[PDB]
């Protein structure tokens, strides 16, 4: 079997964004959109290969 | 900052 060397994981943080532009037929002032971002540093694995 | 291959070019 292929060896499982390690893993990492991150949240995709979804952050609210306020509409500061005036009210429209599309969306009112104070409407709440979002943007999504994820990341970090893992320390993934350390390993030595015999073949 | 050391001696590069192909001579110096900054």
């Amino acid at each position: 079997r292929p060896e499982y060397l390690g893993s990492g994981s991150f949240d995709i943080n979804i952050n609210p964004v306020l509409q500061n532009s005036a009210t429209t037929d599309a969306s009112p002032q104070g409407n709440l959109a979002a943007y999504g971002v994820s990341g970090g540093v893992n320390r993934g694995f350390s390993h030595s290969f015999v073949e | 900052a050391r001696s590069m291959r192909g001579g110096i070019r900054l």
């Binding site: 971002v37 994820s38 | 001696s3 291959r5």
Partner: protein, 49 residues
């Protein structure tokens, strides 16, 4: 907002640095004699190396 990831540009630069030459210096005596006749006022080249 997110944080930017690094570029590999520094490790790629480091792989391109040639090693220094290993020179094999040594110390020795390079003695020599020189014999001549000359007249006053001239610049005589008695030693050349």
């Amino acid at each position: 907002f997110g944080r930017k990831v690094p570029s590999n540009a520094k490790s790629q630069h480091n792989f391109s640095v040639i090693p220094s030459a290993n020179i094999q210096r040594s110390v020795f005596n390079r003695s020599s004699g020189y014999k001549t006749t000359f007249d006053a006022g001239y610049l005589i080249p008695v030693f050349l190396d």
